[PDB]
């Protein structure tokens, strides 16, 4: 197992030197200038990009520069932000801190829902995948995070302090054999993942979202908590309430990020079928 | 008047050499590869750009490359099209021929409605400014041009063969003193313009559009026909049912195109106030 780990390291290293073609990903969030604040997300994209043999090019987008208000306030940076979103082969909403970036992150999720761009939402990214699908597929234009507390009736989320932390399981919903993400997990019955959330999607709404096609393909032990979503019949539109970048490893890339790179490369089928494992 | 015409020619010529800064405009339509097919539109943008002292940079966008379907069909050109739309200081829908480009031209009109980008719609561009404002501000997602005849109930337009052609008047609606476009026309009571249309916006709907803020600031002699719209409280969002590029002249630029360049330059107020007339 020592010699095999070296051989597999020489393989992932060779797959970086032997990398012929680029994948461009827009990472859209608060204060992306502070690049160490997203360090795990970058490394999770790197580990997966060496499995796909493709060169990674993260475009850093400040989420607030996408806003319709930014166009009069700071027009130049607003065009740079939108060129990055328009160029990218995939979109990534990375699980930001606090509310500020939300309005632009909605428009980045809309951009990948409508036009078939590959997408991953992490934590606040699932929250914003659900706020957007509510705000555009159900109408409901007033809907917002539970952070906007005094609106009450239109809160898209509910408090669940138990903060939920550490390695907890997540179980696939037993009918979802079509799912792109539960295929990447090798058809295993459950997964185990890290969490950092005080809010979850309001269970009252989840039947409406499931019936409209925002299928919650994974839930917790109780079945009350929204842990994964996949939009039915889109090339790759995933979100996770957990942070999968806290279990990405260089020889075993975290599956939600592997799917984002592989679909951005247009190769997702063949990665699932096994054309890119390190040893035969 | 001979010597004055030469002096005014030396002035507009000097304003091209003395041009310090660029204005970028996306012209979005069918078959923009066939650049002579939009010749008058280009010349109308050139005449106005010399009044603004600013260098013109038309981005040519094939409207069909903006479509959500183009993303799987021909992904590379779809990113080039969206980068142009995202970069531009103004959007222009030029009065295209036939239906093909419509679905992308809707998304270009939406892009300039929501984010405060300057816009001009000419003929089919007013039709698409009204289809978009219907399709996104009123909901009504099934609405379409009268060209999709067998849908009946959701047709956004009505036949009016009288084809309407040649120089006809248009009269401002007597309350619209706020209007950016009727300010560019010098507060004159009426205008005279060229037409080429078989369809007009269905009069049954126009009260709903006026009440929601898509104010039809100009109509015909009867008041039945939709000749101009301006969206209330946007920096510059105009459309014309007429083709104003068929009366643009090098010393007297056509007013709807002067407003598009001047607002793309962020100077619209000062052009209306008179900081750019050729002789004192």
Curated annotation (Swiss-Prot), chains A, B:
- Gene Ontology annotations of biological process type: 'de novo' CTP biosynthetic process; CTP biosynthetic process; phospholipid biosynthetic process; pyrimidine nucleobase biosynthetic process
Note whether Nucleotide-binding occurs among the keywords.
Answer: yes
Q: Which GO terms describe its molecular function?
A: ATP binding; CTP synthase activity; identical protein binding
Q: Does the keyword Transcription apply?
A: no
Domain named Glutamine amidotransferase type-1 is located at 24-267
One cellular component (GO) term of this entry = fungal-type vacuole
Q: Which residues form the active site?
A: 123, 243, 245
Write the record's keywords in alphabetical order, separated by commas: ATP-binding, Glutamine amidotransferase, Isopeptide bond, Ligase, Nucleotide-binding, Pyrimidine biosynthesis, Ubl conjugation
Cross-link Glycyl lysine isopeptide (Lys-Gly) (interchain with G-Cter in ubiquitin): located at? 141
Query: What family name appears in the similarity comment?
Result: Belongs to the CTP synthase family.
Q: What else is known?
A: Present with 57600 molecules/cell in log phase SD medium.
Primary role: Catalyzes the ATP-dependent amination of UTP to CTP with either L-glutamine or ammonia as the source of nitrogen.
Subunit and interaction comment: Homodimer. Oligomerizes to a tetramer in the presence of its substrates UTP and ATP.
Q: How is this protein named in the record?
A: CTP synthase 1
To which species is this protein native? Answer: Saccharomyces cerevisiae (strain ATCC 204508 / S288c) (Baker's yeast)
Shown portion of the complete protein runs from 282 to 572 of 579
């Amino acid at each position: 197992r020592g010699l095999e780990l070296l051989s597999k390291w020489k393989a992932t290293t060779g797959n970086f030197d032997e990398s012929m073609e680029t994948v461009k990903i827009a990472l859209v969030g608060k204060y992306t200038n502070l690049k160490d604040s997203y360090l795990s997300v970058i490394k999770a994209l790197e580990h997966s990009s060496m499995k796909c043999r493709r060169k990674l090019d993260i475009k850093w987008v400040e989420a607030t520069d996408l806003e319709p208000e930014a166009q009069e306030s700071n027009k130049t940076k607003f065009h740079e932000a939108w060129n990055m979103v328009s160029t990218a082969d995939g979109i990534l909403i990375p699980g930001g801190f606090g509310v500020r970036g939300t309005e632009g992150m909605v428009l980045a999720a809309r951009w990948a829902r409508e036009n078939h761009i590959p997408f991953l939402g992490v934590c606040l990214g699932l929250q914003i995948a659900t706020i957007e699908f509510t705000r555009s597929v159900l109408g409901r234009k007033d809907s917002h995070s539970a952070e906007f507390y005094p609106d009450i009736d239109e809160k898209n989320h509910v408090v669940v302090f138990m903060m939920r932390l550490g390695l907890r399981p997540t179980f696939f919903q037993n009918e979802t054999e079509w799912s792109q993400i539960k295929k990447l997990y090798g058809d295993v019955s459950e997964v185990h993942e890290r969490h950092r959330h005080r809010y979850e999607i309001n269970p009252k709404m989840v039947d409406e979202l499931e019936n409209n096609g925002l299928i919650f393909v994974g839930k917790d032990d109780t079945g009350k908590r929204c842990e994964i979503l996949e939009l039915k019949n889109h090339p790759y539109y995933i979100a996770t309430q957990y942070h999968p970048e806290y279990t990405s490893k260089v020889l075993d890339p975290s599956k939600p990020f592997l799917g984002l790179v592989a679909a951005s490369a247009g190769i997702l089928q063949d990665v699932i079928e096994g054309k890119y494992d390190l040893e035969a």
